[PDB]
């Protein structure tokens, strides 16, 4: 699309997960956004990506933004493993 | 800051200009964000940058998002010249 990157960035900034949507969808949703943006030359690295994902991660997931401070060099895949683990216990 | 790029991206996505702030401040504000983001490896090119600026450009500036369709390959500087010109007439 002509307005591809801009809409991906706004979607990334307005992520709001609480536990309703399956992690499956939410993961591949964010995985795509970062892939598409990176295909178009906009590289959102793991550090910055995780930050934006954990932002707006509310509910019983809220806290993951607090341990993040100890989690340096955390990967997006790792971060979702955590989210997946939470969803399985619901 | 450790959370620099992420906060720059969210600032860019949540821009809301209507005519209150001087164009001077709003311009260099966005000019910096795009420079900082580009220094850190997040390449926001003119096309996508302008798109994100015109998004949330409300008030008497709204119409610049409509003329944009004729303005292909427009630069961020050009886009602000328009915003500056409108601000001068207020």
Swiss-Prot record, chains A, B:
<protein>
    <recommendedName>
        <fullName>Transposon TyH3 Gag polyprotein</fullName>
    </recommendedName>
</protein>
<comment type="subunit">
    <text>Homotrimer.</text>
</comment>
<comment type="function">
    <text>Capsid protein (CA) is the structural component of the virus-like particle (VLP), forming the shell that encapsulates the retrotransposons dimeric RNA genome. The particles are assembled from trimer-clustered units and there are holes in the capsid shells that allow for the diffusion of macromolecules. CA also has nucleocapsid-like chaperone activity, promoting primer tRNA(i)-Met annealing to the multipartite primer-binding site (PBS), dimerization of Ty1 RNA and initiation of reverse transcription.</text>
</comment>
């Amino acid at each position: 699309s002509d307005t591809q990157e801009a809409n991906d960035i706004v979607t990334l900034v307005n992520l709001q997960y609480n536990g309703s949507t399956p992690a499956d969808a939410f993961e591949t949703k964010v995985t795509n956004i970062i892939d598409r943006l990176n295909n178009n030359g906009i590289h959102i690295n793991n550090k910055v990506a995780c930050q934006l994902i954990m932002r707006g991660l509310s509910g019983e997931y809220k806290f993951l933004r607090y341990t993040r401070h100890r989690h340096l060099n955390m990967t997006v895949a790792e971060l979702f493993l955590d989210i997946h683990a939470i969803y399985e216990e619901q």
